[PDB]
Symmetry: C2
Subunit: 278 residues, 2 copies
């Protein structure tokens, strides 16, 4: 049996990631025990108890956006563990997505539509996955001969409320959607993107006319809402299958590895929130 420890089961990547974990694990007649952890302080305790005590042979951990590298390294000391959608410095055993290429594809799509001033709403400063996606965006702008500004890049979060809050901050401080501000924003995760789209609409901005929006990752929500969010689909199911496999293989005696799921490549899903600027 294996443990899947997650920040919350409402998280955007959870459903596809879980189905992958479950399919691989069941394939080997191994069950998946699900656990959910709060914010630190209680967050770290639950994890120490829930990891130490262990009715599980090993652990798949999706790191919380408020857990620093320190809080994870200490807990994972001496535990067979694979981090998923995150990699902690100074240990081995992780499976991540091709985050830089995801940020790059999102950004590139906006540059091909004619946008020059493009903002980025990231996850937290703590989350290595957010920083990779930010890098992809930064490289892409640079190679295209374009500039970003400190004011156009906000560390927010994965969820709707942080996305909303960050859009508000761009709107009020950066003239996002106004006269000389950025005309498009890339959002590091799709739920934050749904929050951003909503806030742009409540503020009175036309989407896509006044502001284009691309989210990274895709859910039924991003595909359902009106206008439907243009997104970059990442292979979440594969990510869960590979991480489950790396863990189970390590329990059979193999080395833990640190890998990047690179196939399939990220898929641009052009919906209704991206157009050329005005």
């Amino acid at each position: 049996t294996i443990g899947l420890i997650v920040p919350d089961v409402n998280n955007a990547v959870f459903a596809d990631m879980f189905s992958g974990v479950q399919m691989a694990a069941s394939g080997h007649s191994t069950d998946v025990l699900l656990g959910q952890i709060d914010a630190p302080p209680r967050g770290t305790q639950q994890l120490s108890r829930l990891v130490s005590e262990g009715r599980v042979d090993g652990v798949l951990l999706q790191r919380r956006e408020d857990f620093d590298d320190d809080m994870l390294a200490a807990v994972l000391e001496g535990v067979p563990a694979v981090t998923i959608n995150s990699r902690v410095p100074g240990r081995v055993g992780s499976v991540i997505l091709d985050d830089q290429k995801g940020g790059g594809i999102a950004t590139e799509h906006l540059i091909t539509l004619g946008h020059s001033r493009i903002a980025f709403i990231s996850g937290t400063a703590i989350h290595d996955t957010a920083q990779r996606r930010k890098e992809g965006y930064l490289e892409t702008l640079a190679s295209a001969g374009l500039r970003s500004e400190a004011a156009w890049v906000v560390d927010a979060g994965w969820e709707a409320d942080a996305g909303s809050a960050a859009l508000n901050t761009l709107y009020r401080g950066a003239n996002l959607g106004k006269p000389d501000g950025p005309t498009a924003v890339v959002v590091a995760s799709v739920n934050a993107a749904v929050g951003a789209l909503s806030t742009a609409l409540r503020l009175g901005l036309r989407v896509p006319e006044d502001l284009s929006i691309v989210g990274i990752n895709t859910t039924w929500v991003s595909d359902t809402v009106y206008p439907a969010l243009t997104t970059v689909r990442l292979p979440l199911q594969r990510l869960g299958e590979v991480a489950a496999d790396v863990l189970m293989e390590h329990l059979g005696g193999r080395a833990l590895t640190d890998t990047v799921v690179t196939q399939p490549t990220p898929e641009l899903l052009v919906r209704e929130t991206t157009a050329p600027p005005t």
Copy 2:
């Protein structure tokens, strides 16, 4: 270890329910195993093997929307089990929400704003939760003393794509949002309600000006979208908390019960999707 068996982790109720089941289990030194089953007989083999091989001590099962009462009985025969957000006649061990009262409260609200032609997009015909909420909406139209038609009640599903399909049908078949049509629609579950909204807007109906939408249950999605969906919040965390408790008390000897979580009461959460017609 106990099993939490659900049809789709994307379900509107899953998150809150699960936090409930985890609370209960955490205090009783018990782990939760998350699982799914296919249609019987496959599913019958699955659930029994889960207990027969000692993988779980007991099961909490949310019924799939394409499971009729016969199918659920099959998989549950000879299994320590408590059904969640659903109740099978012919067996004991279930914990349901105050479903009728929640469907009425959504309808109540639409009439109070001044609506007289009110639709209902249900779950599937075979889900008991969906029918119990349909009952509340009908019973409230009769308490107020108002019209209802066969064409205004459409069976659909829990999910966005079902809600959207049902809305299209109300629009083409029942003239929804037009001179003849109903001016409002209660949607049996929130994801379907987000589907209905989206399709309403695409068509070119203004919401709430041309059509008023209320959903039952509440997620970050219904609160986040624009316009935000008016919904009626049921106490999903307690339902999870209480169901897990009944199963584990039953694993220590107690009888399986059939329970309704009647407190807290359905909370009308007014947002941007409801207005006078």
